[PDB]
Amino acid sequence: SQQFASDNYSGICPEAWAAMEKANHGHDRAYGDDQWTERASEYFRNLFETDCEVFFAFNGTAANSLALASLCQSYHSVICSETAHVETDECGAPEFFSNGSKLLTAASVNGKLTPQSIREVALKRQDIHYPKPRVVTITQATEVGTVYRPDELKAISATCKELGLNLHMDGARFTNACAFLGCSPAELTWKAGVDVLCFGGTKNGMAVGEAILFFNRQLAEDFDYRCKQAGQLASKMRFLSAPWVGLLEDGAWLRHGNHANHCAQLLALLVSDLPGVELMFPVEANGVFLQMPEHAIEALRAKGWRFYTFIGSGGARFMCSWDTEEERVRELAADIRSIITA
Amino acid sequence: DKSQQFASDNYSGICPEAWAAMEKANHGHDRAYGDDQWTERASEYFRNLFETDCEVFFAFNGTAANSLALASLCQSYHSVICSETAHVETDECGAPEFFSNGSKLLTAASVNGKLTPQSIREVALKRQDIHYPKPRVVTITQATEVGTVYRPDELKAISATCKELGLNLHMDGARFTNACAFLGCSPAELTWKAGVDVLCFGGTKNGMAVGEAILFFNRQLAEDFDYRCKQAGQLASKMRFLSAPWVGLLEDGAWLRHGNHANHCAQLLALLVSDLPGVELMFPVEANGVFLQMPEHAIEALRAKGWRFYTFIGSGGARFMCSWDTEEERVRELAADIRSIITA
Amino acid sequence: SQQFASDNYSGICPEAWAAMEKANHGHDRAYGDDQWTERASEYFRNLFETDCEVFFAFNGTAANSLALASLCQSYHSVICSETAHVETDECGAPEFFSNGSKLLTAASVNGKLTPQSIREVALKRQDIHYPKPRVVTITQATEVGTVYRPDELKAISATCKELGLNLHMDGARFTNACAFLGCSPAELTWKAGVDVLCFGGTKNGMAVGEAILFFNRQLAEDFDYRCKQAGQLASKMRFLSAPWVGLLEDGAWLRHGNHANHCAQLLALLVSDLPGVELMFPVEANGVFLQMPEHAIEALRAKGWRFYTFIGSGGARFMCSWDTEEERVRELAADIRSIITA
Amino acid sequence: KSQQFASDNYSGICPEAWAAMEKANHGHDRAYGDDQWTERASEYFRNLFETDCEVFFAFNGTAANSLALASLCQSYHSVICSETAHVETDECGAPEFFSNGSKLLTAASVNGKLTPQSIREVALKRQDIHYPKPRVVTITQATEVGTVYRPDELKAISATCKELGLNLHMDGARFTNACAFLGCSPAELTWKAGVDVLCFGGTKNGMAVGEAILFFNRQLAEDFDYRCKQAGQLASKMRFLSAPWVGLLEDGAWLRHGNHANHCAQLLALLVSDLPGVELMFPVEANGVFLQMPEHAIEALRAKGWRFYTFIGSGGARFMCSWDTEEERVRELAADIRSIITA
Ligand SMILES: Cc1ncc(COP(=O)(O)O)c(C)c1O
Ligand SMILES: Cc1ncc(COP(=O)(O)O)c(C)c1O
Ligand SMILES: Cc1ncc(COP(=O)(O)O)c(C)c1O
Numbered sequence A, C: 001s002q003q004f005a006s007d008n009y010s011g012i013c014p015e016a017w018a019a020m021e022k023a024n025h026g027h028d029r030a031y032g033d034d035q036w037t038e039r040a041s042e043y044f045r046n047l048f049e050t051d052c053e054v055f056f057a058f059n060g061t062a063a064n065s066l067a068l069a070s071l072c073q074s075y076h077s078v079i080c081s082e083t084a085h086v087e088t089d090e091c092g093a094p095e096f097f098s099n100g101s102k103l104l105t106a107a108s109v110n111g112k113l114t115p116q117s118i119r120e121v122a123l124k125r126q127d128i129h130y131p132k133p134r135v136v137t138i139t140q141a142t143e144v145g146t147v148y149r150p151d152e153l154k155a156i157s158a159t160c161k162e163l164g165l166n167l168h169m170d171g172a173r174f175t176n177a178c179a180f181l182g183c184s185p186a187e188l189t190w191k192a193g194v195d196v197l198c199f200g201g202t203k204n205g206m207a208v209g210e211a212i213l214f215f216n217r218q219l220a221e222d223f224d225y226r227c228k229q230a231g232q233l234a235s236k237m238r239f240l241s242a243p244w245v246g247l248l249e250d251g252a253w254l255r256h257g258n259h260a261n262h263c264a265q266l267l268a269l270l271v272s273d274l275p276g277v278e279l280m281f282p283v284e285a286n287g288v289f290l291q292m293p294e295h296a297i298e299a300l301r302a303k304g305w306r307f308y309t310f311i312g313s314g315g316a317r318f319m320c321s322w323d324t325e326e327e328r329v330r331e332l333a334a335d336i337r338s339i340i341t342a
Numbered sequence B: 001d002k003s004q005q006f007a008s009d010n011y012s013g014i015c016p017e018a019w020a021a022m023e024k025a026n027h028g029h030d031r032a033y034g035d036d037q038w039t040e041r042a043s044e045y046f047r048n049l050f051e052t053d054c055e056v057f058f059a060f061n062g063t064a065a066n067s068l069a070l071a072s073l074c075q076s077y078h079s080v081i082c083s084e085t086a087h088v089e090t091d092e093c094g095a096p097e098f099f100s101n102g103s104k105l106l107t108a109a110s111v112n113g114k115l116t117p118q119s120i121r122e123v124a125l126k127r128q129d130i131h132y133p134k135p136r137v138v139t140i141t142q143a144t145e146v147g148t149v150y151r152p153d154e155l156k157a158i159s160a161t162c163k164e165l166g167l168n169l170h171m172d173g174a175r176f177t178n179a180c181a182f183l184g185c186s187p188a189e190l191t192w193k194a195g196v197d198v199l200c201f202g203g204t205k206n207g208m209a210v211g212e213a214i215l216f217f218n219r220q221l222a223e224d225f226d227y228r229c230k231q232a233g234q235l236a237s238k239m240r241f242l243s244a245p246w247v248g249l250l251e252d253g254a255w256l257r258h259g260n261h262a263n264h265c266a267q268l269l270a271l272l273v274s275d276l277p278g279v280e281l282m283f284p285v286e287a288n289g290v291f292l293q294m295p296e297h298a299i300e301a302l303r304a305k306g307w308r309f310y311t312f313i314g315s316g317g318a319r320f321m322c323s324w325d326t327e328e329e330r331v332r333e334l335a336a337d338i339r340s341i342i343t344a
Numbered sequence D: 001k002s003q004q005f006a007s008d009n010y011s012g013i014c015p016e017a018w019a020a021m022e023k024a025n026h027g028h029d030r031a032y033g034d035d036q037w038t039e040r041a042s043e044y045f046r047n048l049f050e051t052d053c054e055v056f057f058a059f060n061g062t063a064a065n066s067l068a069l070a071s072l073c074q075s076y077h078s079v080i081c082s083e084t085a086h087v088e089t090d091e092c093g094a095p096e097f098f099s100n101g102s103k104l105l106t107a108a109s110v111n112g113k114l115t116p117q118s119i120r121e122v123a124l125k126r127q128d129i130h131y132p133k134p135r136v137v138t139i140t141q142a143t144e145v146g147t148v149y150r151p152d153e154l155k156a157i158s159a160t161c162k163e164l165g166l167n168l169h170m171d172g173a174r175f176t177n178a179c180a181f182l183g184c185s186p187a188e189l190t191w192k193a194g195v196d197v198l199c200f201g202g203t204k205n206g207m208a209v210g211e212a213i214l215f216f217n218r219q220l221a222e223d224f225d226y227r228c229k230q231a232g233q234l235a236s237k238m239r240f241l242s243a244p245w246v247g248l249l250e251d252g253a254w255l256r257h258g259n260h261a262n263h264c265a266q267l268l269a270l271l272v273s274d275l276p277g278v279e280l281m282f283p284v285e286a287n288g289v290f291l292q293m294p295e296h297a298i299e300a301l302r303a304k305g306w307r308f309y310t311f312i313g314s315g316g317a318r319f320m321c322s323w324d325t326e327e328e329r330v331r332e333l334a335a336d337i338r339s340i341i342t343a
């Protein structure tokens, strides 16, 4: 019995595990200076069609927090959404890594920032009493399962230029957004004005690690020193970089993302039209956000269905992963149908 | 006439009591960093004034004083609960987060510039999971940034909640004087008798050149605070010039005379104008500021001899602020021009 | 093949690979709340013979830096040796993690602090101009391959208690110290007064991760929040904790350490009676420190041997790992004889 | 008779500072630097240093140096200082707090002074990611042991800093004493010799509170006002930090107070360095006299009513003269040294 709590509970996929076994034969130089790390970096430059600089941190909390700290001073501020992971789920790590850059929440719409909600935040305060906004962060796919599209990104970068702002992307679930859309990685990042991407691996079948991709190379000066000082330098770096070889060499990363997307779409197809069940947001990645009644405690007691419930408390989230079985999706949907109609 | 506007009580000068104390203190050589007669003398007056054995420190300004006090009350992986209009949130260029190394400021709902036990509980109970920094402090401002005052009963309620939730309670008393004068309470009744643990007591705004007193009523919380301040660049070499002015202000009641004056000036203005049509007082005048909804005639009062004052990022709302040295006649001139303008 | 630069270049030992394989069957709850993490902590508790609090971080730099930041405030100081890793190899990580606690170097005989060298540094500075010392960190085995003995530790501990200092152990090479002396782990830590131990895993055959053991559970208050904010919290904690189960269940940790020690003791035995070659320190762990003449170049770059050279001209350090073959040792000692004799 | 030789930090507010504060206390004026006194001070600083330097005020020298160093490199970079540097010995770890972890690396010093060689020693042995990369050099002028960098010593440090990509900061807590002694222009002791940033002490030379921070390289001062604000170092009532500089700078008073304090230290040392068992530990190039003495110094200390800073214990004794030091009291102190040792 697997569950729908989160894609952090999934295991290592076979291509990641296979890269790791290959990387475990021999001795190799530490701290980045190895063949596996240069191969993964080469793959990243080709995938994104650019000479991006590539770094590897241990988890997404540190990767986001480092990236942002490199994009502005402690006396500047960072514009994010209200559901942003850097605002809700990192126990104040950005502020620790930045030595006090304020996160200013902007209004959002479908989990997404807009040009107007940014400007409303930035321009309310170019006075020294306020840390001057200098960075926008967006999550792709968002924390509520939605996806910024290329033109929405460009509109946001446009505001970032009117206002002086760098643009960071938390791509913890970037794959899900690439699977969903036709796009190439480049059209979803630097072609649309993205300065830096944090590209999640852990959630897409890896044991540990995130990649950080600087598309403006002037912003990446000495980033390796920052990472070391912040305790984010793997000595046995191949075991962070090798799985990215596995996942990128013939498109497995994007297959695993389509799978997880298809499971969540299937779940929503099966349940979103029942009575008393409202889809909170369109299913554009691997999550399903349902308003339901006291049937959550029934779906919860009635078999250990494991899933997250909001403090909104008339609301539940189901997350699908690369290793989710369609049959389990149908079984979950069936139990939801039973519990509502009966 | 005249240099004196209605923009900020931070444009006022050094009052005579503060100046006279600095001059006396400028007679001889004394030892540094707190080990002088003036600093001990000032601490005595604070203990006497607050009726308790509070520990006393001096910093250079309110931003550091608040930022130091809050950092001493919880870890970087804990959070601070404040109002949406708290100076620590709006006016300190992120100093609290710098001084604490990353304590998140969590804003709670405000009724009349004030937090309630309810708004504190709501923020606090949503964040027991490790994804959020755990709340460990509530900060309140007295008088508040919209010129309202918390009453001892309002404070006791907050203090109970903080004690139920394991929260320390910090008071930003940049305008503490204005709240004591208005209510007529004792300082002790507006701080530790209602459960305040640490008070930042502003001097600058009420007639000093520089300097803010930090008072720890809960002395477990003050261990090594002097090292914290030193490392933070907040230790005066010539400490007598921070502490002597508090002897000036406290020996004979001048601090409250100056606060009552600024309050009475603010109250006058509101009396003179709050009955005119198209002029709403947004908040009771419980300290030294006046908050008026008016029409686009802000430019009218603004252009008219360049009354200087603050507008909000809001269209038709203005803030007039009085200090220890505001002349009542300037207030009368201002209220007059406000009336002329609205009746024309 | 394999070199003598650092025990950081070695791979994942078999007991640890196996544990990760078993831990990769199924889904598990995140951020520490899994059976592997509980099992690992139980092994530590039995192994050290005490109810110690157990945490996992990603590497030794963060682990040390985290433990030390938890033992004193930013306006306090830490007493460490001049060769301490926290002073030389961490790109200022301790100061970053502690928000500015000063590291005060005390004098070392044989890579080791003494009660006297601690006292000198601590009493010199009881005035506010100086951050007040509040922690002693020692390294076990030390950075020069020596080992503190239970009696030396107890002595250092008596000083710490008298001066109100906490005692931290950087045990990046703790296995080597235990293998060598034959003591119980308890006898080299809490029975001798150690408050906190950073227990190296990466160096003894893991891909990633260190264990942090608090022997005073009150000092561990909220360490989990500290680690989370610092970006040191694994989402898939089982892949940091299961390898510890593998290394500890049947005694592999200590076997792997005796191996690395024996190879290093062999290398020194083979070359010690040579004329131009002097052993700078007793071989008490897995490193050999040799003063020989700048004909280290004929060993080095020349025949392709890899090893670190001390900032002393012709100061070479040779490091043996869990997977060092005795034949490569006998080879290295043979080439050293050719270059010296002829 | 409260007049001692422990520290020029115990001195009072001088008349030119006091009179300037008095003039500034007439009216209302806008806060946080937007002020007639702050602009006048800045113009005096620019004329005095013969250049278009950007001017800031902070509350004290610990913060002034810590802020200046923090703007000159990143937390994962390092600062090269001397073994006697105030930032290393006297600031309770403030540099590291303000920079969020920049390592202070000490370099070998002779007579309180860094040299191009000792800087180079440190900077070139710290070249891989294990070590925070050096990015700044700080020097103190006058130094912590009462000596002075000569313009030519400063040019040579600057040349080494330019070659190594290092910025150059100057802790001028006692800058007045160095200018008074050497007869150089301020420009010749700062930016003509390569200095990027000066912290110019006012408190030690007759003010109540405050330091000036001068950026000669204007690019390095970007957003420095925001850094100061976040660090708790922005005066609401800025006129009371900047007006005393108007008083000190408008007609020479700063140097006159520096020469007085140096001449008083020169007299003290003149009158006693010929006694036996009494030795000057360093040249008297500012307002300090460092004397190696006999433990019986305790009788100068003792019940003689003399305060001064005993070294580690008991060898050294350090004496410091101030703008308000009385020559007579110097002659007294030297006479009481004279007796005690003449028996
Ligand atoms: C949207 C988002 N960003 C970043 C992270 C950080 O992920 P982690 O620290 O578990 O690798 C998560 C969990 C996430 O959901
Ligand atoms: C409510 C409140 N708290 C603190 C401060 C900080 O004062 P300062 O300008 O002296 O840093 C102010 C201005 C304030 O209005
Ligand atoms: C003695 C010592 N302690 C701690 C560490 C930190 O190890 P890591 O390289 O895994 O950050 C090392 C490398 C070390 O040699």
Ligand SMILES: Cc1ncc(COP(=O)(O)O)c(C)c1O
Pocket (backbone or CB within 6 Å): B237, D060, D061, D062, D063, D065, D086, D087, D140, D143, D144, D171, D173, D174, D203
């Ligand atoms: C050489 C030096 N630099 C900086 C300072 C800091 O001065 P303050 O005590 O005003 O913080 C002092 C006292 C000093 O002697």
